[PDB]
Design a protein around this motif. Structure first.
Motif, PDB file in Angstrom:
ATOM      1  N   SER A   1       0.818  -1.198   0.000  1.00 13.70           N
ATOM      2  CA  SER A   1       0.000   0.000   0.000  1.00 13.70           C
ATOM      3  C   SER A   1       0.845   1.237   0.000  1.00 13.70           C
ATOM      4  O   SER A   1       2.066   1.170   0.059  1.00 13.70           O
ATOM      5  CB  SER A   1      -0.912   0.034   1.225  1.00 13.70           C
ATOM      6  OG  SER A   1      -0.225   0.529   2.366  1.00 13.70           O
ATOM      7  N   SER A   2       0.183   2.382  -0.044  1.00 14.91           N
ATOM      8  CA  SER A   2       0.874   3.635   0.172  1.00 14.91           C
ATOM      9  C   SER A   2       1.278   3.715   1.637  1.00 14.91           C
ATOM     10  O   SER A   2       0.472   3.419   2.528  1.00 14.91           O
ATOM     11  CB  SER A   2      -0.005   4.826  -0.219  1.00 14.91           C
ATOM     12  OG  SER A   2      -0.201   4.888  -1.619  1.00 14.91           O
TER      13      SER A   2
ATOM     14  N   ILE B   1       1.794   6.408   3.905  1.00 19.20           N
ATOM     15  CA  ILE B   1       1.537   7.838   3.989  1.00 19.20           C
ATOM     16  C   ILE B   1       2.542   8.524   4.928  1.00 19.20           C
ATOM     17  O   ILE B   1       3.003   7.921   5.907  1.00 19.20           O
ATOM     18  CB  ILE B   1       0.070   8.081   4.434  1.00 19.20           C
ATOM     19  CG1 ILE B   1      -0.666   8.947   3.427  1.00 19.20           C
ATOM     20  CG2 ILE B   1      -0.021   8.688   5.827  1.00 19.20           C
ATOM     21  CD1 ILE B   1      -2.117   9.101   3.784  1.00 19.20           C
TER      22      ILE B   1
ATOM     23  N   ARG C   1      -1.172  14.422  -8.298  1.00 16.97           N
ATOM     24  CA  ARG C   1       0.060  13.999  -7.656  1.00 16.97           C
ATOM     25  C   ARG C   1       1.252  14.077  -8.602  1.00 16.97           C
ATOM     26  O   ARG C   1       2.342  14.472  -8.201  1.00 16.97           O
ATOM     27  CB  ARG C   1      -0.075  12.579  -7.115  1.00 16.97           C
ATOM     28  CG  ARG C   1       1.117  12.128  -6.292  1.00 16.97           C
ATOM     29  CD  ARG C   1       1.604  10.785  -6.759  1.00 16.97           C
ATOM     30  NE  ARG C   1       0.602   9.729  -6.636  1.00 16.97           N
ATOM     31  CZ  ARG C   1       0.250   8.910  -7.624  1.00 16.97           C
ATOM     32  NH1 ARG C   1       0.816   9.018  -8.821  1.00 16.97           N
ATOM     33  NH2 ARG C   1      -0.669   7.982  -7.410  1.00 16.97           N
TER      34      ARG C   1
ATOM     35  N   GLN D   1      -0.632  15.145  -0.948  1.00 14.32           N
ATOM     36  CA  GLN D   1      -1.942  14.646  -0.552  1.00 14.32           C
ATOM     37  C   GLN D   1      -2.948  15.776  -0.736  1.00 14.32           C
ATOM     38  O   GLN D   1      -2.742  16.881  -0.229  1.00 14.32           O
ATOM     39  CB  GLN D   1      -1.940  14.167   0.900  1.00 14.32           C
ATOM     40  CG  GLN D   1      -1.350  12.788   1.132  1.00 14.32           C
ATOM     41  CD  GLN D   1      -1.183  12.497   2.612  1.00 14.32           C
ATOM     42  OE1 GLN D   1      -2.121  12.034   3.274  1.00 14.32           O
ATOM     43  NE2 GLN D   1       0.010  12.792   3.151  1.00 14.32           N
TER      44      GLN D   1
ATOM     45  N   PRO E   1       7.019   6.898   3.165  1.00 16.22           N
ATOM     46  CA  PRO E   1       7.341   6.579   1.774  1.00 16.22           C
ATOM     47  C   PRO E   1       8.818   6.796   1.458  1.00 16.22           C
ATOM     48  O   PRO E   1       9.495   7.523   2.177  1.00 16.22           O
ATOM     49  CB  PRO E   1       6.477   7.567   0.997  1.00 16.22           C
ATOM     50  CG  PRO E   1       6.482   8.782   1.873  1.00 16.22           C
ATOM     51  CD  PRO E   1       6.458   8.257   3.293  1.00 16.22           C
TER      52      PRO E   1
END
Ligand code: MG
Ligand code: MG
Ligand code: MG
Ligand code: MG
Ligand code: MG
Ligand code: MG
Ligand code: MG
Ligand code: MG
Ligand code: MG
Ligand code: MG
Ligand code: MG
Ligand code: MG
Ligand code: MG
Ligand code: MG
Ligand code: MG
Ligand code: MG
Ligand code: MG
Ligand code: MG
Ligand code: MG
Ligand code: MG
Ligand code: MG
Ligand code: MG
Ligand code: MG
Ligand code: MG
Ligand code: MG
Ligand code: MG
Ligand code: MG
Ligand code: MG
Ligand code: MG
Ligand code: MG
Ligand code: MG
Ligand code: MG
Ligand code: MG
Ligand code: MG
Ligand code: MG
Ligand code: MG
Ligand code: MG
Ligand code: MG
Ligand code: MG
Ligand code: MG
Ligand code: MG
Ligand code: MG
Ligand code: ZN
Lengths: 150, 87, 144, 81, 155, 129
Positions: free
Chosen positions: A12-13, A15, A54, A61, D27
């Motif tokens: 997943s991302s 965040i 993005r 975000q 990230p």
RNA sequence: AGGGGAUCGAAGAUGAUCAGAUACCGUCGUAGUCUUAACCAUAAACUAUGCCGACUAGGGAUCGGGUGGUGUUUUUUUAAUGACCCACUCGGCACCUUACGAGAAAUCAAAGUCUUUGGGUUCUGGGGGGAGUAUGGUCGCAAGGCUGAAACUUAAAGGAAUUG
RNA sequence: GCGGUAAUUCCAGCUCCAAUAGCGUAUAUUAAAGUUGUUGCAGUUAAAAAGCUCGUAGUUGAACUUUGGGCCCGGUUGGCCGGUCGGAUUUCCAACGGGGCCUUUCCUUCUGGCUAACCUUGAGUCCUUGUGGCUCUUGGCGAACCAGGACUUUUACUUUGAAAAAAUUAGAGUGUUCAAAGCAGGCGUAUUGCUCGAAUAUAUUAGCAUGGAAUAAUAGAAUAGGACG
RNA sequence: GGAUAGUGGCCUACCAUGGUUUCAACGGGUAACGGGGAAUAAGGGUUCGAUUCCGGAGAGGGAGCCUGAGAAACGGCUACCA
């Protein structure tokens, strides 16, 4: 882990911790919100929008530079669809599988998949139905869905 | 393990692992107690005078005896570098 | 973690499941089906009084060679026909056909005794008196 | 092993862990300012892309998407952050 | 239930011994009687403003609330002037030291002073037997509509 | 899917202790985990622990000595009737002179001895010894 | 129910073998084997091991994905590509070594974290026969599938390992 | 499992064992049985994971929303004194619990009725140089609950209590001669009577009543048909 | 409305289409009267309760009723069945 198969795949991302900033990002909520409208003004999905923002823009975000989630922004300007986006693409998928099945009745693999897709569709609707976003007694029907997505 | 009135009862208060603080019991014939000698000026090694440590048979079976000792002796003063508390 | 439900509301399933499974109890099932009252030569009662039809000479199972003296008895409350062992040395000499006898179980929970095949009862009394007394000498057999 | 600082892990062995398995997760993507000196202005691109991002005014291509990091196009230039 | 007509029976529907003297010209046609049921249940305004008749009405009729107080959750409104609620309840079993879901349906009278729909939580109050099965009479609506109007058309 | 987030934080501890470790990282923490962690600490069965704040649900780093044989959790939070606190400590504590049943009462997450002194009862979380 | 019907081939017929030989081996070869439209719903349908979630230990291979490198190789003029080498990381199919731990053992990274007995949930078993039989219900064109007893009998049946 | 010729199992004699005014047998149930398993079973090979996936009922279901700090009030045990003619209370002392305040903090809400409690103080002081101490009315505390109006998101859990037949059960008192029992009985002026009893516990689900606010649910304002005045 | 001591489909007229159910209705079985209680002793349980007290039902089976404050009474009547 994974609803309709045995895939595990954590993926997943991740965040960022910083809930605000980036501080190398100038511009303004004023700005990208206009940029959110004009995009879903062209018809694109909220998730489609966040991607498009993005990559080409600085929108890390959308939820942060602006105070809110993209869909809520859309709603506020009255750009939200009849039914949620994720639901739509499920229905739109089951349409394409059905079409292919009506053309290939010997294809038991597709028949199995149709079941799965529809069962996700129906469980999702029941959630939406539950939280008043779809009318009580909304319902997915093969006959009516093909007409519904387009 | 005292009694009614202060008196000590129940023989034998066992050794413990300097590393895990588990009891080192009798049939634990794989445990070990290292005696490390104190040294004085000009390297003399002072007989009968040790900094000592005890490691359970458990820890040694698990192969953790060397690393565990490394820490122990060093944050006591017998080593300088070698062991890191981060990884 | 394997088996059964754990939850605080799953009482029902837990009772039901037990109910369902209690049936594999050999004794429970016999109780609830009322097997006793239905099958089984006696009523479900401890003893039964019957009448002597013929005297048998049952040959014993292996590894035993013998002739086990017995009797065919027709239980009075029943018409049910049954065969019963006559315990101790001689005692068959005390019984005679058409005589009245008191039958008991064999202490084996249904089931036959030892090397005697298909016999699940023993005598106990004849003509109102009791083998035991007769065999010893404390009592005598009645007239007719 | 057996005793260690979970709370202050080393940056290298932290740098090599999975992006969701670091101490606090974050990230390892990044943004850059990208320019092809035909123009005089810089556009901002995400290290990963999915959309083949066109410049300000010129229909140009700047990068094509891949399975991860976008491949920047031909002869360009960039600066992270 | 009622609705409309009110004078829609073979017998003329009237409140007992509440006479209106035709000689004395009045400005409200019909004199109406009510009470408060007690236990601090507000006699709602539709009971007084109303013109329905219902002699089983807790506020305008000849019943009294005494006994139990029950709050169920309404599961059927098909019978004219009576409802069935499901009493919501939960039940312990010692051997297993857990509980098991149970329910009981209860039939209750419902005055035209109230306007109940399926889903409403409803506080009912015991009264004398009123019918073969009904020993309860609505008395107060804890609900409203359960988010109905918050489900209209698109934007 | 995680049912008892407590259960994980307890188990994880036990495993570390057994493997002879001195610290666990646990995930994802809760109010309940903390308070349970807090009781254990009040009685010595662990040392210092630390809440690291992912912007998620949390992680905890516990530092344990070695005085811990077991810290378990009672899977249904059974209601306990103050009279039956006895019966619980009996079923699952090593002796009457030490060890604790720790439970959740209307007056806070407390070990059964405190629960007795304060005269309250309730549902039952796990235990330590 | 049509089509197909090369091959191999239940059945049948045969040559031999045999005390016999309804077989094994050899020959002929019906159904079948293939396909369409419908049935049937069972396999040692097996890893004889339910699913989701956590934790607990080492190692080299390998499949897919991704990231990193003044790595190798391709020559053109260096790149760009491409295949390859090293490190790392998710997710796979597996193997190796240990065992803290588990087991009646054989063994097992789960079959571990269980009398120090509770993460959530489904399902099945309760000595052996009688018997997956009788009966009723239901599905099926049939063959049969699902559901599924008792009377009676019996001291063992069974598992793993050891020595012969 | 014994018995087919020297039977430690049969039929007897002798001797010995166990329970004994009683002891065997039969049938049933209970304990043994963690072989019905909530506590607490088992399912690779011993009996047992549906061929496979979807799925309704049912069960189960991540984290987060008043936490931390400050001040008072009065309790019940225990230490060290004991003052006192076995037990006593002030202060020295910790310890464990209850209540109420202040910290940005509804305690349902107005309209009086009530006030027990101090920011009060009006005088001063029994008396240890005094905040050690309480009576004491004319400015300044609400909640402690009366009763009338106006309104109240739903539950589970837990606490304390009420309402509650006796006999049974647990158990106190009392020498039925003992005891199972019974609920009696005990003292003298045993010549005109004196007197202790006839407890307590349990009584669980549901209903009632009171306290708690952790754990677990419900409901809330997003097309604002939102909130106060 | 009638009936009742009195509420009530208790019964009758009119009118309507409801009521219960996998949270197991409805049906079957019970060698089933319920309870206080009994047995068995780590705990959790398991089995039992025709039977000294409380409640209910019955008087060979059914129904009907007179008297009366009270009975659908049986050491009351009436009919039918045995
Ligand atoms: Mg996962
Ligand atoms: Mg699923
Ligand atoms: Mg993905
Ligand atoms: Mg079976
Ligand atoms: Mg014969
Ligand atoms: Mg008869
Ligand atoms: Mg109607
Ligand atoms: Mg052919
Ligand atoms: Mg042939
Ligand atoms: Mg031949
Ligand atoms: Mg043949
Ligand atoms: Mg099968
Ligand atoms: Mg296989
Ligand atoms: Mg590994
Ligand atoms: Mg690369
Ligand atoms: Mg034998
Ligand atoms: Mg061998
Ligand atoms: Mg001899
Ligand atoms: Mg002899
Ligand atoms: Mg002898
Ligand atoms: Mg005896
Ligand atoms: Mg339990
Ligand atoms: Mg077993
Ligand atoms: Mg098997
Ligand atoms: Mg399987
Ligand atoms: Mg199924
Ligand atoms: Mg939760
Ligand atoms: Mg109580
Ligand atoms: Mg009493
Ligand atoms: Mg009517
Ligand atoms: Mg008619
Ligand atoms: Mg109808
Ligand atoms: Mg059932
Ligand atoms: Mg009966
Ligand atoms: Mg009785
Ligand atoms: Mg009974
Ligand atoms: Mg009887
Ligand atoms: Mg009578
Ligand atoms: Mg008679
Ligand atoms: Mg009759
Ligand atoms: Mg009569
Ligand atoms: Mg009489
Ligand atoms: Zn450009």
């Amino acid at each position: 882990g994974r609803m309709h198969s045995a895939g595990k795949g954590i993926s997943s991302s991740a965040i960022p911790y910083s809930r605000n900033a980036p501080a190398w990002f100038k511009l303004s909520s004023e700005s990208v919100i206009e940029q959110i409208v004009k995009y879903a003004r062209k018809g694109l999905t909220p998730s489609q929008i966040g991607v498009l923002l993005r990559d080409a823009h600085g929108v890390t975000q959308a939820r942060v530079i602006t105070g809110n989630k993209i869909m809520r922004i859309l709603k506020s300007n009255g750009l939200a669809p009849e039914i949620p986006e994720d639901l739509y693409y499920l229905i739109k998928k089951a349409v394409s599988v059905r079409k292919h099945l009506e053309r290939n009745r010997k294809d038991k693999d597709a028949k199995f998949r149709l079941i799965l897709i529809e069962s996700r569709i129906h469980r999702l609707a029941r959630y939406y139905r539950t939280v008043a976003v779809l009318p009580p007694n909304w319902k997915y029907e093969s006959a009516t869905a093909s007409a519904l997505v387009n | 393990m005292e009694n009614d009135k202060g008196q000590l009862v129940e023989l034998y208060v066992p050794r413990k692992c300097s590393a895990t603080n588990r009891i080192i019991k009798a049939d634990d014939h794989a445990s070990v107690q290292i005696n490390v000698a104190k040294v004085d000026e000009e390297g003399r090694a002072i007989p009968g005078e040790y900094v000592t440590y005890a490691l359970s048979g458990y820890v040694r079976s698990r192969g953790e005896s060397d690393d565990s000792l490394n820490r122990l002796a060093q944050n006591d003063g017998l080593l300088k570098n070698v062991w890191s508390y981060s990884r | 973690g394997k088996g059964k439900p754990r939850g605080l509301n799953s009482a029902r399933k837990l009772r039901v499941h037990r109910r369902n499974n209690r049936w594999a109890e050999n004794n429970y099932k016999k109780r609830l089906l009322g097997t006793a009252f239905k099958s089984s030569p006696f009523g479900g009662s401890s003893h039964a009084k019957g009448i002597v039809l013929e005297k048998l000479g049952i040959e014993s199972k292996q590894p035993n060679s013998a002739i086990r003296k017995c009797v065919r008895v027709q239980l009075i409350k029943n018409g049910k026909k049954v065969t019963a062992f006559v315990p101790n040395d001689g005692c068959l000499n005390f019984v005679d056909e058409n005589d009245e006898v008191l039958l008991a179980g064999f202490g084996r929970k249904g089931k036959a005794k030892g090397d005697i095949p298909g016999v699940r009862f023993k005598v106990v009394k004849v003509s109102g008196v009791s083998l035991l007394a007769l065999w010893k000498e404390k009592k005598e057999k009645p007239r007719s | 092993v057996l005793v260690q600082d979970l709370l202050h892990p080393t940056a290298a062995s932290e740098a090599r862990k999975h992006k969701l398995k670091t101490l606090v997760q974050g990230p390892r993507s990044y943004f850059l300012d990208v320019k092809c000196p035909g123009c005089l202005n810089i556009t901002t691109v995400f290290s990963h892309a999915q959309t083949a991002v066109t410049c300000e005014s010129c229909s140009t291509i700047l990068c094509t998407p891949t399975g991860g990091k976008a491949k920047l196009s031909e002869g360009t230039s960039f600066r992270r952050k | 239930s009622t609705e409309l007509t009110v004078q829609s029976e073979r017998a003329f529907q009237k409140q007992p011994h509440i006479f209106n003297n035709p000689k004395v010209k009045t400005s409200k046609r019909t004199k109406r009687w009510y009470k408060n049921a007690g236990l601090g249940f507000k006699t709602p305004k539709t009971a007084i403003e109303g013109s329905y008749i219902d002699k089983k009405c807790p506020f305008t009729g000849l019943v009294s609330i005494r006994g139990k107080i029950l709050t169920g959750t309404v599961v059927s409104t098909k019978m004219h002037r009576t409802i069935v609620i499901r009493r919501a309840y939960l039940h312990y079993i010692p051997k297993y030291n857990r509980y098991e879901k149970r329910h009981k349906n209860v039939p209750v009278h419902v005055s035209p002073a109230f306007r109940v729909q399926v889903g409403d939580i409803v506080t009912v109050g015991q009264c004398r037997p009123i019918s073969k099965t009904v020993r309860f009479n609505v008395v107060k609506v804890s609900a409203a509509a359960a988010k109905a109007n918050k489900q209209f058309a698109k934007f | 899917t995680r049912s008892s987030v407590l259960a994980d934080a307890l188990n994880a501890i036990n495993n570390a202790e057994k493997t002879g470790k001195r610290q666990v990282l646990i995930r994802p923490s809760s109010k309940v985990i903390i308070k349970f962690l807090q009781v254990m600490q009040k009685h010595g069965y662990i040392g210092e622990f630390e809440y690291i704040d992912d912007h998620r649900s949390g992680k905890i780093v516990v530092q344990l000595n070695g005085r811990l044989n077991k810290c378990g959790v009672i899977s249904p939070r059974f209601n306990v009737k103050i009279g039956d606190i006895e019966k619980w400590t009996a079923n699952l504590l090593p002796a009457r002179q030490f060890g604790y049943v720790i439970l959740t009462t209307s007056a806070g997450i407390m070990d059964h001895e405190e629960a007795r002194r304060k005269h309250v009862s309730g549902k039952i979380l796990g235990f330590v010894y």
